[PDB]
């Protein structure tokens, strides 16, 4: 298992859907990669939801975020592989945390609310 600590962690199918939204919003410029820009989106409050990586090491550097996500009441999930995550973000270098941000004019908004809803299902 990808660490005992990191929670929640989606399955292969929902991971596939979430990564699909990652690539899509990445094509719509509605995504912000990286832990620092994820943190910036959380502080600004424009973040729809946070994706993070399970296989990353060390895990703590991604474990600073869940506290901030629970503070701002924003959903977050853990895709298993940072290589697949950044690969979906469109960067060869593996990305650990990505953030789907808010756009009122976005065409994928409904997709973001559906995936976000399933994320809130996972959160517990």
């Amino acid at each position: 298992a990808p660490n005992p600590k990191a929670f929640p962690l989606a399955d292969a199918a929902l991971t596939q859907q979430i990564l699909d939204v990652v690539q899509q919003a990445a094509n719509l410029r509605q995504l912000k990669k990286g832990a620092n820009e994820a943190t910036k989106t959380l502080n600004r409050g424009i973040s729809e939801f946070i994706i993070m990586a399970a296989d990353c090491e060390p895990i703590e550097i991604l474990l600073h975020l869940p506290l901030l996500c629970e503070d701002k009441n924003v959903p977050y999930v853990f895709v298993p592989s940072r290589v697949a995550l950044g690969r979906a973000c469109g960067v060869s270098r593996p990305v650990i945390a990505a953030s789907i941000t808010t756009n009122d004019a976005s065409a994928i908004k409904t997709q973001i609310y559906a995936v976000k809803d399933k994320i809130e299902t996972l959160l517990i």
Binding site: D11, A12, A13, Q16, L19, D20, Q23, A84, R87, A88, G90, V91, S92
Partner: protein, 48 residues
């Protein structure tokens, strides 16, 4: 009738999903450039 002496630990009972691998605009441009380079050199050397 049941056994008090011991404690059972039975049946740790337990779906393939196609992995879609996206990739960069750099590897899309590089990929198309390589494919069209193969077809282009194939038609050029072939017609040569």
């Amino acid at each position: 009738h049941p056994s008090i002496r011991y404690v059972a630990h039975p049946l740790p009972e337990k779906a393939k999903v196609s992995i879609k691998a996206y990739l960069t605009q750099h590897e899309r441009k590089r990929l198309r450039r390589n494919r069209r380079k193969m077809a282009r050199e194939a038609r050029e050397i072939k017609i040569k």
